[PDB]
């Protein structure tokens, strides 16, 4: 069985990953007074499969550049992103890990390399610099991203994502800790290099030399991430109702909240101009990190003096 449970949890996500690009090229469209892709297939349903086939057939130019790295970078990007769905506790997780959120934080952190490796691998004075933008911002946003989670955990009692289903049986962790949700949402927007925070590759990064199959793999990775991070928002802060008798209403609402917050970063992209490179770091180190570190202390104090220290386990 376990193998079947690996197809499910992977394919299903890959098929959904494909349908996100479509729902991105149509929701951005209607917002901009245009139908979007509807001519290939019915209502554009076959559109994601079509360019996938075009991308794989076109020559992996491999310009030329250091090869191995040019092929480790996309493989790593898809591998880490699809891997991070292994522990997500949609209802029951697949591989329940006692230190689950540390797994998600660590696996995300590793993706910054793919950007670094791809940038060095293309032999471009200019592309090399582009990777720097992403690698620097990734680790930067990672610092507030991690502290925001540590505040959460201390009110959850453990690192296991499964505990939050029992923590959020009466109220979402948005009500409490909303100030961080916003700061988790903005950080989720940075770490998926989506719009407000997509200086990288705005013009000026690590796809510059990447075409056909390599382009696709990161590509796939980004979009799967786009979902995963949104899904982590939909478990950590928006806690879907859980009934032990019927486990799927948890997944049904997880489905609904994930799609809406995934819709939100699509909506954010069309709505906002891109921030400047330093404007972006100015936000995290000046605007958010002092807010996060202080609210981090408030979340070590809220438990103690409100005699609410969370139950381990």
């Amino acid at each position: 069985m376990f193998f079947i449970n690996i197809l499910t949890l992977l394919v299903p996500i890959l098929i959904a990953m494909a349908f996100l690009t479509l729902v991105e090229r149509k929701i951005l469209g209607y917002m901009q007074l245009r139908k979007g892709p509807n001519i290939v297939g019915p209502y554009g349903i076959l559109q994601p499969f079509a360019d996938a086939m075009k991308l794989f057939m076109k020559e992996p130019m491999r310009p030329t550049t250091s090869m191995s790295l040019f092929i480790i970078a996309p493989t790593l990007s898809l591998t880490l992103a699809l891997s991070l769905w292994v522990p997500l506790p949609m209802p029951h997780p697949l591989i329940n890990l006692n230190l689950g959120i540390l797994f998600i934080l660590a696996t995300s952190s590793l993706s910054v390399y793919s950007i670094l490796w791809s940038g060095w691998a293309s032999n471009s004075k200019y592309s090399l610099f582009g990777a720097l933008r992403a690698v620097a911002q990734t680790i930067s946003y990672e610092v507030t991203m991690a502290i925001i989670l540590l505040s959460v955990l201390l009110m959850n009692g453990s690192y296991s994502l499964q505990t939050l289903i029992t923590t959020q049986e009466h109220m979402w962790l948005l009500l409490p800790a909303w100030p961080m949700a916003m700061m988790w949402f903005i950080s989720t927007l940075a770490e998926t290099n989506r719009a407000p925070f997509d200086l990288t590759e705005g013009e000026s990064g690590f796809n510059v030399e990447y075409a056909a199959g390599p382009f696709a793999l990161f590509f796939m990775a980004e979009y799967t991430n786009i979902i995963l991070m949104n899904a982590l928002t939909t478990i950590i802060f928006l806690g879907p109702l859980y009934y032990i008798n019927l486990p799927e209403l948890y997944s049904t609402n997880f489905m609904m909240e994930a799609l809406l917050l995934s819709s939100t970063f699509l909506w954010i992209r069309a709505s906002y101009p891109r921030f400047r490179y330093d404007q972006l770091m100015h936000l995290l180190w000046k605007n958010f990190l002092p807010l996060t570190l202080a609210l981090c202390m408030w979340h070590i104090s809220l438990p103690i003096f409100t005699a609410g220290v969370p139950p381990y386990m």
């Binding site: 030329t64 550049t65 250091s66 032999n123």
Partner: protein, 340 residues
């Protein structure tokens, strides 16, 4: 039937050579169409490759100079209409691999004999047939032996048909030079007799092309069997190393019996997609270049051969690593010339 040559000599000018060229898509071909187009000649390029691949040839020809007709070797009618309005027919039809539906004899001998028969019917003034150098009916490689059978036949279908017989060609996109350079993937570079006793004389592609073109526009060549050869001969050893030299990749010549090696060629030959090496290739590679005794080609036909070292840098540059690409030929050491 003729076209007075008017113009200054460049594109958008007229030279009066309407010429069917059946195998233009080829490495040699590309060059043949280049000069013919530069000169302003009318070029009819028969093609059976897809239109996307034939696009590269469009730009060197001026507006209306190049006409591309579809054509199938098995179908005699296609050859018939191609030469309908041409007065010069050039045949470059050959493939070193024997494909499933075309056997070495068919491409080298059957297809040319029919093509030559058609232009005698059409009334083309001259036909140029190209066959590999050192080609004898009892030679080692079938390709060569067959090609030799071919040059004979076409004479009977088309008398006084020029027969240029080029050596293996040196040029960007050629095999002779790239093949060896691509042995990099192979950690060791096998060389029969450790790359000795198979002295080889390369010839730049352009020289060959210019020569061929000059044939089309010269009465001196009729029934002539020219041999474009080169400006310097070489023992395969220096050639191999030299290549690796410009490519800046290590060289480990390794002796391996041609017996066993013919087998390696068989292995690649087995591959479905354009075998990289050919049993028939292998033999050819270690088939010693013959000393020029046939009709002089280059120079005789008007182009002075171009030494290999001169343009080698351009052919082998892509084979090179990222570093060493700015390495230039004169700081590097040119290999010795063995006439033997």
């Amino acid at each position: 039937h003729a076209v007075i040559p008017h113009g200054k000599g460049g594109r958008s000018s007229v030279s009066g050579v309407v010429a069917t060229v059946f195998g233009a898509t080829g490495f040699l071909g590309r060059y043949v169409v280049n000069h013919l187009g530069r000169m302003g000649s009318q070029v009819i390029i028969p093609y059976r490759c897809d239109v996307y691949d034939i696009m590269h040839l469009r730009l060197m020809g001026d507006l209306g100079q190049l006409t591309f007709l579809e054509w199938d070797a098995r179908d005699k009618d296609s050859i018939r209409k191609a030469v309908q309005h041409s007065n010069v027919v050039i045949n470059l039809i050959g493939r070193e691999w024997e494909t499933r539906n075309f056997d070495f004899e068919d491409v080298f001998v059957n297809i040319p004999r029919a093509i030559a028969q058609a232009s005698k019917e059409a009334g083309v003034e001259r036909f140029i047939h190209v066959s590999h150098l050192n080609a004898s009916m009892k030679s080692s490689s079938k390709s060569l032996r067959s090609k030799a059978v071919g040059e004979k036949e076409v004479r009977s279908v088309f008398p006084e048909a020029i027969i240029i017989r080029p050596s293996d060609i040196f040029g960007r996109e050629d095999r002779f030079l790239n093949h060896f350079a691509n042995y990099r993937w192979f950690l060791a570079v096998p060389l029969v007799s450790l790359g000795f006793k198979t002295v080889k004389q390369p010839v730049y592609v352009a020289d060959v092309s210019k020569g061929i073109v000059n044939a089309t526009k010269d009465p001196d060549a009729v029934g002539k069997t020219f041999a474009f050869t080169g400006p310097n001969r070489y023992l395969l050893f220096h050639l191999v190393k030299y290549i690796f030299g410009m490519t800046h990749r290590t060289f480990i010549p390794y002796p391996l019996p041609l017996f066993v090696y013919s087998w390696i060629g068989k292995l690649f030959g087995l591959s479905p997609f354009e075998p990289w090496t050919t049993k028939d290739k292998v033999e050819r590679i270690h088939i010693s270049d013959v000393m020029p005794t046939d009709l002089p080609g280059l120079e005789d036909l008007g182009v002075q051969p171009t030494p290999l070292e001169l343009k080698s840098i351009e052919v082998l540059r892509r084979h090179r690593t990222y570093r060493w690409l700015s390495s230039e030929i004169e700081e590097t050491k040119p290999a010795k010339t063995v006439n033997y």
